[PDB]
Design a protein around this nucleic acid. Structure first.
Length: 425
DNA sequence: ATTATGACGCT
DNA sequence: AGCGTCAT
C-alpha cells in the first residue's frame, strides 16, 4: 500500500525522428516531399537495399531491409534517394549532421541522451517543475496539446477521437496539486509539443514522441501514434495497455530473451508477467533481468536518462557479401585504407567540434562461411589520427587470420574500424 | 546478398 | 579484453 513505490518520480520522453533519412532527402529535394519515397544504399544488386521509408510509401507495404526492385513491385511510383558513396562505401555524413541540428535544438529544453542517430531520450523532470511553478495553478488548455494522444482515452474521425480523449483527460485533471504524477506528465507533454514545434520550425523535420515516467514506457508510447504525433502513457494506463501487449514490443524483449520469457512461462502479453514473484523471474532469467521484469510489467523502470548528446564511438563498416568477399592481401589492405580514411576525416572533425580524442581502435572482421557476425574483434592503441597508420595497425592485428601459403583465405565478408574510449582534449 | 551503424551486458 | 544481444 503506502510503501510500494510506483516509479512516478520522473518525467521522461522518447523523441524519434520520423523516417529520418527520408526527411533529410525531402528537405534537400522538394520534389520528394509528401510522396511515397525511400532511401536506398547502393544500386546494382536488385536496385539497392532500402533503409528508410516515408509513411506514404509504408502504406504500399514498402519496408526497410527490402530490395528496391521489390519495393517497386509494391509501389511503382515510389521515389528513391541514394545514400552518398565515398571511397567505395556508403557515407552517412549528411544524416549525422542533420541529427546534430536536431539534438542541439532538443538540448535547449531538457537534458537529452542520444540513443541513436534518429532518437533521443529527454529528462523533463526539472523542466516540468519549473513550468509548474510558472503556471501558478492555471489550468492546462487543450490548445497547448494540439498533437497529443492520451493512451487509453476516450473510454465509456481520427482527430475527433484524439480530441475526445484529450478533453476527458484534461477535465479529470487536478491542477492544484503540484505533485500529482498525471499533472507532471501533462506538463511534460506541453513542453514536448513546444520542443517538437521548435525542431520543425528550425529544421523542417517532424518527429513523434512518447511521454511517460521512464524510458521504456516513453519508447513504447512513442510508437502508438505515428507519424508527427505524441502519446502520453500515464501510470494508470499501464494495466490495460499491457493486458494485450505482446512481450516482444517492450524495448529489450524483441529478441532471444523475450522469446524465452514467452516459452518458459507460457504467456503472450506483458501484463501476464505480474502473476510471478520477483524470485521466480530471477530464477528463470537471472537476478538482473528478473528484477527488471518484475518492475517493468508494473510500469516501473529505473534506468536513468544519461546526459550524453554525443556518440560514444565513431565507426566505419562495410560488408562484402556473396562473391564480393575479399580474397587477396591487396584487397584487404585497400579496403582497410578506405575505411581508415573515412575514420580519420570523421575523427578530426570530431576532435575540433567536441574537444576529445579517441584512444582505442577496435577492428572487427567476418570471414566467409563463419556463422557469427563478428569472426574476430581485436583492439589496438589509437595514438594519432592518421589513416595509413590505422589501416596498417588493423592489418597487423588481423593478419594471422589468413590461412593461405598474397591470397586471403577464408575470404572476408565484413571489415569494421571503430574509434572508442574518448578522453577530453 | 535483412546496411551501417550505434547502444550495452557477460565473463 | 573478446564475445554476445538488441535495435533501426
Amino acid at each position: 500500500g503506502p510503501h510500494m513505490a510506483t516509479g512516478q518520480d520522473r518525467v521522461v520522453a522518447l523523441v524519434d525522428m520520423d523516417c529520418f533519412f527520408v526527411q533529410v532527402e525531402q528537405r534537400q529535394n522538394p520534389h520528394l516531399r509528401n510522396k511515397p519515397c525511400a532511401v536506398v544504399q547502393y544500386k546494382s544488386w536488385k536496385g539497392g537495399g532500402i533503409i528508410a521509408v516515408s509513411y506514404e510509401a509504408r502504406a504500399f507495404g514498402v519496408t526497410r531491409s527490402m530490395w528496391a526492385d521489390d519495393a517497386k513491385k509494391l509501389c511503382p511510383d515510389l521515389l528513391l534517394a541514394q545514400v552518398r558513396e565515398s571511397r567505395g562505401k556508403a557515407n552517412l555524413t549528411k544524416y549525422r549532421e542533420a541529427s546534430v541540428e536536431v539534438m542541439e535544438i532538443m538540448s535547449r529544453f531538457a537534458v537529452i541522451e542520444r540513443a541513436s542517430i534518429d532518437e533521443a531520450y529527454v529528462d523533463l523532470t526539472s523542466a516540468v517543475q519549473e513550468r509548474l511553478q510558472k503556471l501558478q495553478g492555471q489550468p492546462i488548455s487543450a490548445d497547448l496539446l494540439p498533437s497529443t494522444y492520451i493512451e487509453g482515452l476516450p473510454q465509456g474521425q481520427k482527430e475527433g477521437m484524439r480530441k475526445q480523449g484529450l478533453f476527458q483527460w484534461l477535465d479529470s485533471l487536478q491542477i492544484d496539486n503540484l505533485t500529482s504524477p498525471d499533472l507532471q506528465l501533462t506538463v511534460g507533454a506541453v513542453i514536448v509539443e513546444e520542443m517538437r514545434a521548435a525542431i520543425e520550425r528550425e529544421t523542417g523535420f517532424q518527429c513523434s514522441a512518447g511521454i511517460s515516467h521512464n524510458k521504456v514506457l516513453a519508447k513504447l508510447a512513442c510508437g502508438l501514434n505515428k507519424p508527427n504525433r505524441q502519446t502520453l502513457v500515464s501510470h494508470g494506463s499501464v494495466p490495460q495497455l499491457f493486458s494485450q501487449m505482446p512481450i516482444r514490443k517492450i524495448r529489450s524483449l524483441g529478441g532471444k530473451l523475450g522469446a524465452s520469457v514467452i516459452e518458459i512461462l507460457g504467456i503472450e502479453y506483458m501484463g501476464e508477467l505480474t502473476q510471478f514473484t520477483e524470485s521466480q523471474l530471477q530464477s528463470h532469467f537471472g537476478e538482473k533481468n528478473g528484477s527488471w521484469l518484475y518492475a517493468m510489467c508494473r510500469g516501473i523502470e529505473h534506468d536513468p536518462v544519461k546526459p550524453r548528446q554525443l556518440p560514444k564511438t565513431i565507426g566505419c563498416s562495410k560488408n562484402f557479401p556473396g562473391k564480393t568477399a575479399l580474397a587477396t592481401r591487396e584487397q584487404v589492405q585497400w579496403w582497410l585504407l578506405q575505411l581508415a580514411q573515412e575514420l580519420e576525416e570523421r575523427l578530426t572533425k570530431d576532435r575540433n567540434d567536441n574537444d576529445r580524442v579517441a584512444t582505442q581502435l577496435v577492428v572487427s572482421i567476418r570471414v566467409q562461411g563463419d556463422k557469427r557476425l563478428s569472426s574476430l574483434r581485436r583492439c589496438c592503441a589509437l595514438t594519432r589520427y592518421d589513416a595509413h597508420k590505422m589501416s596498417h595497425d588493423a592489418f597487423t592485428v588481423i593478419k594471422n587470420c589468413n590461412t593461405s601459403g598474397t591470397e586471403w583465405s577464408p575470404p572476408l565478408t565484413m571489415l569494421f574500424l571503430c574509434a572508442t574510449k574518448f578522453s577530453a582534449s
